[PDB]
Amino acid sequence: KRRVVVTGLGMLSPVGNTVESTWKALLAGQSGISLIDHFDTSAYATKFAGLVKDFNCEDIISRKEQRKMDAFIQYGIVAGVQAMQDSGLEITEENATRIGAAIGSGIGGLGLIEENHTSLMNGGPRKISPFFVPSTIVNMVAGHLTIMYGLRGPSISIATAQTSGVHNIGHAARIIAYGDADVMVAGGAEKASTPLGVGGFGAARALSTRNDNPQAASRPWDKERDGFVLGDGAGMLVLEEYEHAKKRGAKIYAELVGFGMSSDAYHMTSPPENGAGAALAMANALRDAGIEASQIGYVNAHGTSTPAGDKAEAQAVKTIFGEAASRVLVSSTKSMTGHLLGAAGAVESIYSILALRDQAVPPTINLDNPDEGCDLDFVPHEARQVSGMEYTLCNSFGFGGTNGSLIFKKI
Amino acid sequence: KRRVVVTGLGMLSPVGNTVESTWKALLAGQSGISLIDHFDTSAYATKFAGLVKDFNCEDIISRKEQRKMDAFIQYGIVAGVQAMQDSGLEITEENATRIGAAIGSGIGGLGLIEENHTSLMNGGPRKISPFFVPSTIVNMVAGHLTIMYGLRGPSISIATAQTSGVHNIGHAARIIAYGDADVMVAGGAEKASTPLGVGGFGAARALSTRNDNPQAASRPWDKERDGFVLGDGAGMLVLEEYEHAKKRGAKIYAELVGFGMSSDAYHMTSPPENGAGAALAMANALRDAGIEASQIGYVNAHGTSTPAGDKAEAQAVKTIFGEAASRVLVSSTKSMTGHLLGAAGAVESIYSILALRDQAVPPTINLDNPDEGCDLDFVPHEARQVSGMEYTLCNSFGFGGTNGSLIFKKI
């Protein structure tokens, strides 16, 4: 029976370019949301997002190699290098074959897709970059990292839209526990803050339009919610078989004990009013961990700040927690970070882990006026100190009614 | 110990719009390659591809719903419906929760990406479709099918470029064998025959430019190879836990016994000259099946018809088979079908299965003059009858040095 533990963390987010700086900001209730300036937003109904500030990879990726990669790829490689470094793992010829990667993205290289399509329209196929395909496709973060570190074990990339980060981490663990690997770098990367990303989610009327106050836009469970806020970033974890970790004297952040998946089988983009899908995913993770809902102390919600989605997740929590629905802490970091899509469940898994290390639960900021029949504790406004918390649960749901839940356990 | 078996098959390919018609064509050595006419190819160095002919979904997808989906999605849903129907499985409230999907794509909705970007350039963000995001993203075949059939078990979508079909089928099996599901519809869909797809792989100089003879272009291991040929399609299999299948009186095509993954850790798009990556993937699948290379009778190669890739796979076969390198049959159906990218390993897994049912191995057509140091039997020109073949192996390798191998066993 193989246990999986988290021994390395990496991260780029709208509130910090490292794991510790990101975490510190979240516990301080800071927003990472700001107005966009990298493209003309005049015609856009949403003119803001959660951006990665002063991103720099010069020391990690040559400007010459940068040409071959979309921003989402560069982000994911940087967060991957941070995680590899943090793990302290040494890759040997004897090792290579047993270390892999499970890293994806929801939308991939929109920026380079646009640039390449603009070239084609303006001057024909001759103007398309020879790097078009491999610079934009979702699996290239795992591609580049395995090459950089000489990793030869299994590499997959799960692209389940807004559920990717969770799915990738969950399967990286299945792979280790199955015996196909001893270590996996797992997570997601996204850089969808582009004319197509912003224009596209805006066309769907899914985005908040509160441009007069970008930092107050993201407000899960708040009566004045008006759609999600888009965020860029990457979250990576180094997952490792327990005995392997111990033997190397690895620093161990927490243990991955439960992974649950489900499908809404309802609508292509909207969640069912009763969150039955989210319920099954949480129910499946608990059964996989072999514990009861009552044992979870903190749920890092999907909580995107859409009228219908926030309401469906709340329904799902009540269904799963029932009695202890009020004693469990539930919060959406998306209130400060925005929605990182394919990277959401990856960064949120990290927050779920750090909440166990620090016994602190980040707040859901902007929750000035909660919905009515709410009996749940959404950790409004201020971070909460906790005491004997041994497990956290991370939710992610996505287009296609695809859901995932991960369960982390202290030590 | 849970066994996985294939109880349903679905398929759209350049040589047929059904499983049996496709298979019949391949055994007859027919090409599905033709000149493109859905876009002006004047400026294109490659003016042909493996197209799906007279595709029709009218009875399966309303014209009203079609608007919300890229061709690759419509293809995948149709192949999915065929597979569900072929399986005879009946979805009940007691069932729903135990049936899922693992379906992906390498590139996703290029056509709708282009259409939407063209609109944006021509008339601004206001012209972007509200369906932009969910009509193009890779996980929407699993999205739509789970909804269509009320499937509520696990849904994931692996996007590992040219390795997707294999990866998805392999993980759908891991999911069942793990206990997270009893049935999974698994596979891939691709429709990359677009200005960006054709122009993009052409910019990389990866495509064959033999336009004077489209049907002879794809010619794996042939001295006059000049790059791969692009093909469109979808391949879907219904995978099912053995006991569950038996109890329902399911028709069983074959058993899925081995799944292997590896990474080249070499180059972002090219394979290492020694095919060490492909070797490890095949080696891992054998160990997972717990059999010896000598036991495989037919290898459906990745065999894309590139100078370097064909040569690397041959090296990898010799390394793995050694002695029996000459006694194993190896063939590339891509010689007739073209390269279906994310759908390649899905349709090729189906051919690997049917070769067991019919004891017949499709040829590698166009192999007029093999490379030199070749001692391998590439089933040139004509299909081969075989006798006591109990196992087949299917290879898929992709950008990012990502590899997968699947092993099918008779009965």
| Rounded-to-integer distance, Cα A60 and Cα A229, Å | 30
- What is the distance in angstroms between the Cα of B380 and the nearest Cα belonging to chain A? 31
Residue given tokens 């805006």 in the structure block: A202
* Domain count along chain A: 2
Q: Which positions in chain B touch A96 (Cβ < 8 Å)?
A: 265
B339 and A CB contact within 8 Å: no
Q: Residues 6 or more apart from B24 whose CB is under 8 A from it? A: B16
> In this complex, do A400 and B143 lie within 8 Å of one another by their Cβ atoms?
yes
DSSP for B298-347? Answer: EEE----S-HHHHHHHHHHHHHHHGGGGTTSEEE-THHHH-B-GGGHHHH
Q: What does the radius of gyration of chain A's CA atoms come to, in whole angstroms? A: 20
**Which of B36, B84, B157 to substitute to test the interface with A, most A CBs within 10 Å?**
B157
Q: Which positions in chain B touch A144 (Cβ < 8 Å)?
A: 268, 400
Search chain B and give the residue with CA nearest A134: B399
If one counts every other C-beta atom within 10 angstroms of the C-beta of residue B155, the result is 34
- What is the distance in angstroms between the Cα of B153 and the nearest Cα belonging to chain A? 5
| Rounded-to-integer distance, Cα B411 and Cα B398, Å | 30
Burial of A369 (0-12, 13-18, 19+ CB in 10 A): exposed
Residue given tokens 């969950």 in the structure block: A170
SS3 B348: helix
Do A316 and A196 share a domain, yes or no? no
Going across the sheet that includes A402-409, the strands are A155-156, A99-104, A183-190, A233-241, A4-12, A254-263, A402-409, A391-398, A298-300, A329-331
> In this complex, do A128 and B157 lie within 8 Å of one another by their Cβ atoms?
no
If one counts every other C-beta atom within 10 angstroms of the C-beta of residue A120, the result is 24
**Which of A131, A140, A160 to substitute to test the interface with B, most B CBs within 10 Å?**
A160
Handedness of CA B355, B22, B90, B181 (dihedral sign): positive
Q: Residues 6 or more apart from B330 whose CB is under 8 A from it? A: B298, B299, B301, B303, B317, B376, B377, B378, B379
| Rounded-to-integer distance, Cα A45 and Cα A304, Å | 18
Residue given tokens 């109880």 in the structure block: B7
The answer to whether A232 and A193 are in contact (CB under 8 A) is: yes
Range of B100's domain? 5-258
SS3 B404: strand
Secondary structure letter of residue B108 according to DSSP: -
Angstrom CA distances, A397 to A106, A201, A230, stand at 12, 16, 15
Do A57 and A104 share a domain, yes or no? yes
Angstrom CA distances, A157 to A141, A142, B111, stand at 9, 7, 23
Do B157 and B281 share a domain, yes or no? no
| Rounded-to-integer distance, Cα A170 and Cα A407, Å | 10
| Rounded-to-integer distance, Cα A176 and Cα B96, Å | 28
Q: How was this structure determined?
A: X-ray
The answer to whether A259 and A337 are in contact (CB under 8 A) is: no
| Rounded-to-integer distance, Cα B235 and Cα B105, Å | 11
Residues forming beta bridges with residue A393, ordered by sequence position? A299, A407
Per-residue tokens: A383: 């971070």
Do A215 and A329 share a domain, yes or no? no
Domain boundary among the residues A212, A243, A258 is at: A258
If one counts every other C-beta atom within 10 angstroms of the C-beta of residue B410, the result is 17
Residue given tokens 């698994």 in the structure block: B186
Stated length of chain A: 411
Stated length of chain B: 411
Q: Which CATH number characterizes residue B69's domain?
A: 3.40.47.10
Per-residue tokens: A306: 């859409």
- What is the distance in angstroms between the Cα of A48 and the nearest Cα belonging to chain B? 15
Buried b (16+ CB within 10 A) or exposed e, A41-78: beebbbbbbbbbeeeebeeebeeeebebbbbbbbbbbb
Per-residue tokens: B9: 């098959």
> In this complex, do A152 and B126 lie within 8 Å of one another by their Cβ atoms?
no
- How many contacts, defined by CB atoms under 8 Å, are there between A and B? 267
> In this complex, do A280 and B97 lie within 8 Å of one another by their Cβ atoms?
yes
Nearest to B155 by CA among A220, A268, A298: A268
Do A109 and A226 share a domain, yes or no? yes
| Rounded-to-integer distance, Cα B202 and Cα B142, Å | 30
Do B64 and B148 share a domain, yes or no? yes
**Which of A402, A403, A405, A406 to substitute to test the interface with B, most B CBs within 10 Å?**
A402
Q: Residues 6 or more apart from A368 whose CB is under 8 A from it? A: A219, A222, A224
**B110-123 and B71-87 helices, crossing angle to 10°:** 150
Which amino acid type is present at position B329?
L
If one counts every other C-beta atom within 10 angstroms of the C-beta of residue B40, the result is 10
Nearest-by-Cβ selection for B167 from A44, A156, A202: A156
Q: What does the radius of gyration of chain B's CA atoms come to, in whole angstroms? A: 20
Q: Which positions in chain A touch B156 (Cβ < 8 Å)?
A: 158, 160, 167, 171, 261, 402
DSSP for B79-94? Answer: HHHHHHHHHT----TT
Domain boundary among the residues A215, A243, A258 is at: A258
SS (H, E, C) chain A: CCCEEEEEEEEEECCECCHHHHHHHHHCCCCCEEECCCCCCCCCCCCEEECCCCCCCCCCCCHHHHCCCCHHHHHHHHHHHHHHHHHCCCCCCCCHHHEEEEEECCCCCHHHHHHHHHHHHHHCHHHCCCCHHHHHCCCHHHHHHHHHCCCCCCEECECCHHHHHHHHHHHHHHHHHHCCCCEEEEEEEECCCCHHHHHHHHHCCCECCCCCCHHHHCCCCECCCCCECEECEEEEEEEEEHHHHHHHCCCCCEEEEEEEEEECCCCCCCCCCCCHHHHHHHHHHHHHHCCCHHHCCEEECCCCCCHHHHHHHHHHHHHHHHHHHCCCEEECCHHHHCECHHHHHHHHHHHHHHHHHCCEECCECCCCCECCCCCCECCECCCEECCCCCEEEEEEEECCCEEEEEEEECC
| Rounded-to-integer distance, Cα A38 and Cα A26, Å | 25
Q: Residues 6 or more apart from B281 whose CB is under 8 A from it? A: B260, B261, B262, B395, B397, B403, B404, B405
Classify B366 in phi/psi space as left (phi over 0), alpha (psi -120 to 50) or beta. left
| Rounded-to-integer distance, Cα B176 and Cα A38, Å | 46
Secondary structure letter of residue B126 according to DSSP: G
Do A11 and A44 share a domain, yes or no? yes
Nearest to A240 by CA among A155, A291, A167, A175: A175
| Rounded-to-integer distance, Cα A34 and Cα B85, Å | 50
Q: Residues 6 or more apart from B245 whose CB is under 8 A from it? A: B5, B7, B252
| Rounded-to-integer distance, Cα A91 and Cα A153, Å | 12
Å resolution of this model? 2.3
* H/E run at residue B177: helix B164-178
**Which of B103, B133, B193, B284 to substitute to test the interface with A, most A CBs within 10 Å?**
B133
Residue given tokens 């400026």 in the structure block: B43
- What is the distance in angstroms between the Cα of A346 and the nearest Cα belonging to chain B? 16
The answer to whether B99 and B256 are in contact (CB under 8 A) is: no
Do B162 and B283 share a domain, yes or no? no
Nearest to B137 by CA among A149, A309, A204, A228: A204
Report the first-to-last Cα separation within chain A, whole angstroms. 17
B337 and A CB contact within 8 Å: no
B85 and A CB contact within 8 Å: no
Q: Which positions in chain B touch A107 (Cβ < 8 Å)?
A: 133, 137
Do A342 and A233 share a domain, yes or no? no
**Which of A39, A155, A269 to substitute to test the interface with B, most B CBs within 10 Å?**
A155
Do A190 and A270 share a domain, yes or no? no
* H/E run at residue B210: none
Per-residue tokens: B332: 């590339």
> In this complex, do A156 and B161 lie within 8 Å of one another by their Cβ atoms?
no
Per-residue tokens: A393: 């649960």
Q: Which positions in chain A touch B74 (Cβ < 8 Å)?
A: none
Nearest-by-Cβ selection for B154 from A137, A161, A261: A261
**A71-87 and A110-123 helices, crossing angle to 10°:** 150
B398 and A CB contact within 8 Å: yes
Q: Which positions in chain B touch A203 (Cβ < 8 Å)?
A: 125, 128-130, 132
The answer to whether A152 and A96 are in contact (CB under 8 A) is: yes
Per-residue tokens: B409: 């066993």
* H/E run at residue B355: helix B344-357
Domain boundary among the residues B218, B238, B258 is at: B258
Do A200 and A272 share a domain, yes or no? no
Per-residue tokens: A211: 């441009």
SS3 B160: coil
Nearest to A404 by CA among A239, A193, A166, A244: A166
- What is the distance in angstroms between the Cα of B264 and the nearest Cα belonging to chain A? 6
| Rounded-to-integer distance, Cα A320 and Cα A302, Å | 15
Which amino acid type is present at position A217?
A
SS3 B286: helix
Which amino acid type is present at position B171?
H
B contact residues 167-226, partner A, Cβ 8 Å cutoff:
167, 171, 174, 178, 180, 195-196, 198-205
| Rounded-to-integer distance, Cα B34 and Cα B46, Å | 11
Nearest to B31 by CA among B308, B371, B332: B332
Nearest to A8 by CA among A145, A144, A104, A159: A145
Secondary structure letter of residue B360 according to DSSP: E
Per-residue tokens: A110: 């929109």
Residue given tokens 């093909």 in the structure block: B231
B55 and A CB contact within 8 Å: no
Nearest to B43 by CA among A130, A117, A133, A126: A126
| Rounded-to-integer distance, Cα B349 and Cα B353, Å | 6
SS3 B386: coil
Nearest to B182 by CA among B253, B79, B92, B85: B92
Do B281 and B172 share a domain, yes or no? no
Handedness of CA A91, A97, A99, A105 (dihedral sign): positive
Buried b (16+ CB within 10 A) or exposed e, A14-31: bbbbbbeebbebbbebbb
Per-residue tokens: B181: 């599901």
| Rounded-to-integer distance, Cα B168 and Cα B156, Å | 8
